[PDB]
Amino acid sequence: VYRNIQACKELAQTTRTAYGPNGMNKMVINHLEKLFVTNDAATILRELEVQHPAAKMIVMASHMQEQEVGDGTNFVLVFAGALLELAEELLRIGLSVSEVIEGYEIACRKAHEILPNLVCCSAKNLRDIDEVSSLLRTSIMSKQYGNEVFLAKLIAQACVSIFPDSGHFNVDNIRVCKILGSGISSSSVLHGMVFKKETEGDVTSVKDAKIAVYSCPFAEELMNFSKGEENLMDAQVKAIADTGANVVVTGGKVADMALHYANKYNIMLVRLNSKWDLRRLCKTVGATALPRLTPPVLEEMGHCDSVYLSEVGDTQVVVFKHEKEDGAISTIVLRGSTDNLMDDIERAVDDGVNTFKVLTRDKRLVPGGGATEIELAKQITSYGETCPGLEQYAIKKFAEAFEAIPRALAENSGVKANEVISKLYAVHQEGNKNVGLDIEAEVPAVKDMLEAGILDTYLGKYWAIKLATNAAVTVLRVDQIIM
Amino acid sequence: VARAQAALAVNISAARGLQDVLRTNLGPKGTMKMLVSGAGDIKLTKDGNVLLHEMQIQHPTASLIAKVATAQDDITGDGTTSNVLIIGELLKQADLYISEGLHPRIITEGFEAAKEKALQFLEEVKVSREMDRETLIDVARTSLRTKVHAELADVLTEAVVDSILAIKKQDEPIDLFMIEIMEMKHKSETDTSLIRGLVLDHGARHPDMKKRVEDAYILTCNVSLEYEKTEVNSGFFSAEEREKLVKAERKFIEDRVKKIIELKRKVCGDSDKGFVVINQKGIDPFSLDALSKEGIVALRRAKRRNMERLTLACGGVALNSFDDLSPDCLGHAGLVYEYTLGEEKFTFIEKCNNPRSVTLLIKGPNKHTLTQIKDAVRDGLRAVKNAIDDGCVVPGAGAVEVAMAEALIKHKPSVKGRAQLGVQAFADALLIIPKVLAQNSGFDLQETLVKIQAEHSESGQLVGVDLNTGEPMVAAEVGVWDNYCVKKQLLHSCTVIATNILLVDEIM
Amino acid sequence: VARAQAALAVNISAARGLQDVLRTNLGPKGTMKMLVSGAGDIKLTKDGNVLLHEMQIQHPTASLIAKVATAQDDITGDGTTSNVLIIGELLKQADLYISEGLHPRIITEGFEAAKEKALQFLEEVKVSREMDRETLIDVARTSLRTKVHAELADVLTEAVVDSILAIKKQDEPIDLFMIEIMEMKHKSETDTSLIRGLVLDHGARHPDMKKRVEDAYILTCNVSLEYEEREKLVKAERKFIEDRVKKIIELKRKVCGDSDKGFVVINQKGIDPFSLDALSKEGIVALRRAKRRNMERLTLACGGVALNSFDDLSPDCLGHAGLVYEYTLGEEKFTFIEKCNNPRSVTLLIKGPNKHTLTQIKDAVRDGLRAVKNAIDDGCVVPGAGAVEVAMAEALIKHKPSVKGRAQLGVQAFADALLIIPKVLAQNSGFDLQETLVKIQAEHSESGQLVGVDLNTGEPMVAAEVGVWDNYCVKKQLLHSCTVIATNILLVDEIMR
Amino acid sequence: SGRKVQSGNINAAKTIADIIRTCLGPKSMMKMLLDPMGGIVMTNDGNAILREIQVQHPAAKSMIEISRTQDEEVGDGTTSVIILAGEMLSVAEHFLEQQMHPTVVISAYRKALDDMISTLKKISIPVDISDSDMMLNIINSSITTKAISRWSSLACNIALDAVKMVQFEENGRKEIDIKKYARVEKIPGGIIEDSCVLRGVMINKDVTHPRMRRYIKNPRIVLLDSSLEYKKGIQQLCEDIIQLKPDVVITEKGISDLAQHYLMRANITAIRRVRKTDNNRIARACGARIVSRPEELREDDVGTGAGLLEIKKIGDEYFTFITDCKDPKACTILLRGASKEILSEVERNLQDAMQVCRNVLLDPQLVPGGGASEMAVAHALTEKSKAMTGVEQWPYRAVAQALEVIPRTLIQNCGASTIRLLTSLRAKHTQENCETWGVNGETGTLVDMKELGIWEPLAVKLQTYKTAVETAVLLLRIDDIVSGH
Ligand SMILES: Nc1ncnc2c1ncn2[C@@H]1O[C@H](COP(=O)(O)OP(=O)(O)O)[C@@H](O)[C@H]1O
CATH number at residue B178: 3.30.260.10
Closest of D413, D279, D64 to residue C1, by C-alpha: D413
Answer for the pair C341, C303: CB distance below 8 angstroms, yes or no: yes
Q: Hey, are the CB atoms on A418 and D430 less than 8 Å from each other?
A: no
C406 with B444: Cβ contact below 8 A: yes
Q: Give C-chain residues touching D40 at CB under 8 angstroms.
A: 60-61, 63-64, 67
CB contact under 8 A, D389 and A422: yes
Tell me how crowded residue B83 is: count the other CB atoms within 10 A of its CB.
28
Under DSSP, is residue A267 helix (H, G, I), strand (E, B) or coil? coil
CA distance C206 to D117: 98
Burial (CB < 10 A; 0-12, 13-18, 19+), residue D439, is buried
Distance (Å, whole) CA A400 – CA A378 = 9
Residues C210, C165, single domain; the answer is no
Distance, in Å, from the CA atom of A384 to the CA atom of A392, rounded to the nearest integer, reads 5
- Please tell me whether residues B277 and B409 are part of one structural domain: no
Cα D349 to Cα D355: distance, rounded to the nearest angstrom: 10
β-pair partners for A229: none
**CA–CA distance, B192 with B154 (Å, rounded to integer):** 12
B324 is catalytic: no
Beta-sheet pairing, B215-221 with B273-279:
parallel
Among protein residues, the one whose CA lies closest to atom 6 of ligand 1: A369
Q: From A301, A327, A353, give the residue that closes a domain.
A: A327
Asked if residue C145 and residue C248 are part of one domain, the reply reads: no
Do A267 and A197 lie in one domain? The reply is: yes
Inter-chain CB proximity D420 and A418 less than 8 Å = no
Rounded to the nearest angstrom, the distance between the alpha carbon of A6 and the centre of ligand 1 is 26
CA distance A61 to A80: 10
Same domain flag for C283 and C354: no
User: Which atom of ligand 1 lies at the shortest distance from residue A21's CA?
Assistant: 8
Cβ of A359 below 6 Å from ligand 1: no
Query: Which residues have CB under 8 Å from D236's CB, separation 6+?
Result: none
Dihedral sign, CA of A420, A425, A431, A434? positive
Provide the residue type at B60 as one letter: P
CATH code of A265's domain: 3.50.7.10
Examine the domain organization and report whether A372 and A354 are in the same domain: no
Contact B501, B111 (CB under 8 A): no
Q: Which amino acid appears at position B393 of this protein?
A: V
Chain centre to alpha carbon of residue A59: 17
Domain finish residue from A340, A363, A386: A363
Please tell me whether residues B382 and B247 are part of one structural domain.
no
Nearest one of D481, D473, D465, D462 to D92, comparing CA atoms: D473
* Entry resolution (Å): 4.0
Same-domain pairing of A228 and A240: yes
**Integer CA distances (angstroms), C269 to B415, C245, C249, in order:** 76, 15, 20
Out of D27, D29, D32, closest to residue C495 by CB: D32
Residues C277 and C363 both lie in one domain: no
Single-letter residue type at C461: M
**Selected residues 292-311 of chain A with any CB under 8 Å from a CB in chain B:** 292, 294-297
Asked if residues D357 and D421 have their Cβ atoms less than 8 Å apart, the reply is no
Distance A369 CA to ligand 1 centre (A): 6
Rounded Cα distance between B245 and B239, Å, is: 10
Q: What b/e readout covers D12-48, taking b as 16+ CB neighbours within 10 angstroms? A: bbbebbbbbbbbbbebbbbbbbbeeeeebeebeebbe
| Strands D220-223 and D289-290, sheet pairing | parallel
**Residue D185: enclosing H or E segment and its boundaries?**
strand D183-186
**Contacting residues for C86 by C-beta, under 8 A, at least 6 apart:** C417, C418, C420, C421, C478, C482
Instruction: Supply the angle between the helices C60-73 and C2-21 in degrees, to the nearest 10.
Output: 50
Distance CA D138, CA D132 (A): 10
Q: How far is CA D477 from the centre of its chain?
A: 28
B347 is in an annotated binding site: no
- Phi and psi at residue D333, to the nearest 5°: -125, 110
CB distance A191 to A330 below 8 Å: yes
**How far is the C-alpha of D163 from the C-alpha of D140, rounded, in Å?**
17
Query: Quick one: which of B275, B267, B273, B277 has its CA closest to B322?
Result: B277
> Is C455:C153 a contact under the CB 8 Å cutoff?
no
- CB-based contact C492 D32, cutoff 8 Å: yes
Residues A357 and A468 in one domain: no
Whether residues A418 and D98 touch (CB distance < 8 A) is answered with yes
Residue C444 contacts residue C460 (beta carbons within 8 Å): yes
D45, D71, D115, D363: which one is catalytic? D45
Question: Same structural domain for residues C408 and C492?
Answer: yes
Which among B73, B284, B375, B379 is annotated as catalytic?
B379
Direct distance between the N- and C-terminal alpha carbons of chain C, in angstroms, rounded to an integer: 19
CATH label of the domain that carries residue C479:
1.10.560.10
D352 is known as an active-site residue: yes
Contact partners, residue C162, CB within 8 Å, separation at least 6:
C194
**Which residue stretches of C160-264 are H helix?**
161-166, 233-252
DSSP 3-state of C157: helix
Greatest Cα-to-Cα distance within chain D, rounded to the nearest angstrom: 88
Planar angle of CA B17, B19, B20, nearest 5 degrees: 75
Q: Is B446 close to C408, i.e. CB distance below 8 A? A: no
Whether C90 and C413 have beta carbons less than 8 Å apart is answered as: yes
**Structural domain for A166, as ranges:** 123-191+328-363
Residue B483 is which amino acid? Answer: N
CA gap D245, D259 in Å, rounded: 18
Tell me if there are at least 3 CB pairs under 8 Å linking chains C and B: yes
Give CA–CA dist B156/C47, Å, rounded.
73
Residues C253 and C337 in one domain: yes
CB A312: neighbour CB atoms within 10 A? 16
Q: Which residues are bridge partners to B217 per DSSP?
A: B275
Residue A371 and residue A469 in one domain? yes
Does the beta carbon of A273 lie inside 6 Å of ligand 1?
no
Residues C172 and C221 in one domain: no
Instruction: Flag whether A2 is marked binding.
Output: no
Q: Is A369 annotated as ligand-binding?
A: yes
Integer Cα distance of A100 and A389 in angstroms:
12
**Domain final residue pick, B338, B364, B391:** B391
Q: Which of A98, A474, A479 is the closest to B441 by Cβ?
A: A98
Residue C471: Cβ-neighbour burial (10 angstroms; 0-12, 13-18, 19+):
buried
Annotated binding site of D for Mg(2+): 76
Interface test with chain B among C102, C103, C434, by most B beta carbons within 10 Å: C434
Same domain, A77 and A133: no
In the chain, the amino acid numbered B79 is G
**Which chains, if any, share at least 3 CB pairs under 8 A with chain A?**
B, D
**Ligand 1 atom having least distance to the Cα of A368:** 27
Determine the Cα–Cα distance for residues A156 and B61; give it in Å rounded to an integer.
65
Beta bridge partners of B92: none
Q: Find out whether C75 and C473 touch, Cβ atoms under 8 Å.
A: yes
| Helix residue ranges, H only, A362-403 | 371-384, 391-402
Q: Which runs of E-coded beta strand occur in B19-167?
A: 33-35, 43-45
| Single-letter amino acid code for the residue at D277 | T
> What CA–CA distance (Å, rounded) separates B425 from D76?
52
Give yes or no for residue A73 CB within 6 A of ligand 1: yes
Give the residue numbers spanning the domain of B141.
Answer: 130-196+356-391
Say how many C-beta atoms besides its own lie within 10 A of residue B489's C-beta. Answer: 17
Q: Give residue A398 CA to ligand 1 midpoint distance, Å.
A: 21
In this structure, the answer to whether residues C312 and C240 fall within a common structural domain is: yes
One domain, residues B343 and B360:
no
Residue pair B493/B72 in contact by the 8 Å Cβ criterion: yes
* Residue B412 vs residues B114, B419, B425, C415, C438: alpha-carbon distances, Å: 11, 11, 14, 19, 11
Domain count of chain A? Answer: 3
**Per the structure, how many domains does chain B have?**
3
Fold of D128-198+329-364: GROEL; domain 2 (3.30.260)
Q: Is there an atom of ligand 1 within 6 Å of A74 CB? A: yes
- From residue B332, how far is each of B274, B328, B346, C192 by CA, in Å? 11, 11, 19, 115
Residue nearest ligand 1's atom 16 by CA: A20
Q: Is B207 on the interface with A (CB under 8 A)?
A: no
DSSP one-letter string for C446-494: SS---EEEPTTT--EEESTTTT-EE-HHHHHHHHHHHHHHHHHHHT---
User: Are A and C close enough to touch, i.e. 3+ CB pairs under 8 angstroms?
Assistant: no
Q: Cβ separation of A481 and B229 shorter than 8 Å? A: no
Q: Whose CA is nearest to atom 8 of ligand 1?
A: A142
CATH superfamily of D1-127+365-485: GroEL-like equatorial domain (1.10.560.10)
Local structure of residue D128 (DSSP, 8 states):
P
Q: For residues B11 and B84, give the distance between their C-alpha atoms in angstroms, rounded to a whole number.
A: 13
Instruction: Based on the fold, state whether residues C365 and C440 are members of the same structural domain.
Output: no
CA distances from A422 to A121, A452, D383, D482 (A): 28, 21, 17, 36
Task: Please answer whether residues A411 and A417 qualify as being in contact, where contact means their C-beta atoms are separated by less than 8 angstroms.
Answer: yes
Asked if residue C326 lies in contact with residue C211, where contact means CB atoms within 8 angstroms, the answer is yes
Experimental technique for the deposited model: cryo-EM
The answer to whether the beta carbons of residues A379 and A114 sit under 8 Å apart is yes
Exposure of C362 by Cβ count < 10 A (0-12 exposed, 13-18 middle, 19+ buried)? middle
Strand partners, B474: B463
Give the residue, out of A78, A142, A407, A448, with the most ligand 1 atoms within 8 A of its beta carbon, to mutate for a pocket test: A142
